[PDB]
Amino acid sequence: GSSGSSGPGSPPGEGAPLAADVYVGNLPRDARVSDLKRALRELGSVPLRLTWQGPRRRAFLHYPDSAAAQQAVSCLQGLRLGTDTLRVALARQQRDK
Q1: 3-class secondary structure, 62
Q2: Which positions fall inside the RRM domain?
Q3: How far is CA 93 from the centre of its chain?
Q4: Which strands make up the sheet holding 58-62, listed edge to edge?
Q5: Segment (H or E) for 96
Q6: Which string of DSSP letters, residue by residue, matches 8-40?
Q7: Taking the CA of residue 58 as centre, how many other CA atoms within 13 Å lie in the half-sphere pointing to its CB?
Q8: CATH for 10-97, among 3.90.190.20, 3.90.1150.10, 3.30.70.330, 3.40.50.1000?
Q9: Per-residue b/e over 1-14, b at no fewer than 16 CB within 10 Å?
């Protein structure tokens, strides 16, 4: 074997909006909320609320607090349904009225 190095450094979580909403796009043609839910369940990534859209092919996971979200995301990452690789990433947008 061979090892002996660290790799610290993670997107801080203080001061910025407590937006604990994860964005999910690039869903199959006729994807089913279940398909996604299941994976989330087994992955212990079950949020309080989940907004799934059909014709729009989008999904929004609402976690209790940022922490909960972050942890989940890292896990969700990579996960894909079929051939297409779902586009999962913390929902962030600068929309100021």
Answers
A1: strand
A2: 20-93
A3: 15
A4: 49-53, 58-62, 21-25, 87-90
A5: none
A6: ------SSS----EEEEE---TT--HHHHHHHH
A7: 8
A8: 3.30.70.330
A9: eeeeeeeeeeeeee
Under a CB-based contact definition with an 8 Å cutoff, are residues 49 and 1 in contact? no
Q: Method used for this model?
A: NMR
Q: Which residue has the tokens 């996971």?
A: 61
Shortest CA distance to 84 belongs to which of 23, 36, 17, 29? 29
Residue spans per domain, the chain = 10-97
- Residue in 94, 64, 84, 65 with CA at minimum distance from that of residue 24: 84
